[PDB]
Design a protein around this ligand. Sequence first.
Ligand code: HEM
Ligand SMILES: CCOc1ccccc1O
Length: 403
Amino acid sequence: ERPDLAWLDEVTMTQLERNPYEVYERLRAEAPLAFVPVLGSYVASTAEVCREVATSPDFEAVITPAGGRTFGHPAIIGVNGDIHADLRSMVEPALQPAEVDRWIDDLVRPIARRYLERFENDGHAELVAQYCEPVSVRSLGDLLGLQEVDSDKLREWFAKLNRSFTNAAVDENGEFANPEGFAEGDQAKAEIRAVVDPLIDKWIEHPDDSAISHWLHDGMPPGQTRDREYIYPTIYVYLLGAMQEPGHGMASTLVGLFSRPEQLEEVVDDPTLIPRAIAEGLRWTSPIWSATARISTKPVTIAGVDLPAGTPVMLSYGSANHDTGKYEAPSQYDLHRPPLPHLAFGAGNHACAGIYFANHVMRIALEELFEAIPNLERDTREGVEFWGWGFRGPTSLHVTWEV
Ligand code: HEM
Ligand SMILES: CCOc1ccccc1O
């Protein structure tokens, strides 16, 4: 409908999944708020518009269409008002910085060592499958109370939920172009229910220190628990992004450091630079790239576009983090970029609740990897491909080292 953006009609879902950055560079210049036909929604592409929409009093959270088809209600990302306040109060205790600092080292560091011990003398490894994902999922799984769910299963679940949640393509009539793409999300949920329903059965009667037990019990009247149907969608929110994103952020940070060998050596030699390297990694390839959205609650004008009430806007934070109004040469990883605000954790009342936790998981994992393999090098016989529009990260990271 917007004439000068007719080229957007030829943008495909596969193009955005393989590399959304060329399309979004055009969007940031041509239309910071733009309706993308294959996505069926307005998208915010610049830092200014994403931040404005994420923090505006005239917008509230909305789950994307494929996200809602995947998670249902009440996903913490998709609700507001009293339900959102309750779900935030439910998840926040274990994520409080003073609480994280009590146990994060004893949680993540032995896990990192366990996975490293399997390959650190091999001289070769694919770090996404052998290290970044296992550490991410084993750390969160143990915190949640899923100690008995193997890391290969947690990784399979977040991969299936990822593809279902981002199964966003719509056809010429605005209907989902790929309805079969939700089936593997439904199968993952069915498997999760089979595993987790007995655990909830047990936690209701015998609460323990697992996070999901506290989600059932915290803040409830005596002898009452939150209904499992009320907390399952937020369990799914965790079993997708909370399981997936720390591993993605680790791996993207490593790919960026390998792209700047001098900076990789700097960080190996001085591990106090790991937090800075990670912050730049998150900006450089944002793990949550375009997964969340807001919806207008009254008529509003954003970036010159008059939106009616009830208009969804997708928040493409991964594009906003390449906003050249903010950053010079943003497609280059640069550890020595000044530490500027970024949107990799979102903004507003629905901003990431687990920032402090996630930053420490990533930090500890990279600390242990560099201590165990200080001569780590990328395997240049291998290419690194990144995949994902909703969630983005490298699909493999082949490395080598002299042993
Ligand atoms: C590096 C890994 C992570 C990245 C890049 C990250 C980035 C985000 C982003 C972009 C959002 C959406 C914010 C918005 O719409 O404005 C988010 C929502 C959230 N994240 Fe994180 N996240 C990360 C790891 C976690 C972890 C490990 C947890 C849990 C332990 C976590 C708990 C949340 C929760 C509960 C929400 C929903 C917040 C709400 O809607 O009220 N995140 N995260
Ligand atoms: C823990 C955050 O997980 C998500 C965030 C935004 C969209 C989907 C998610 O699973």
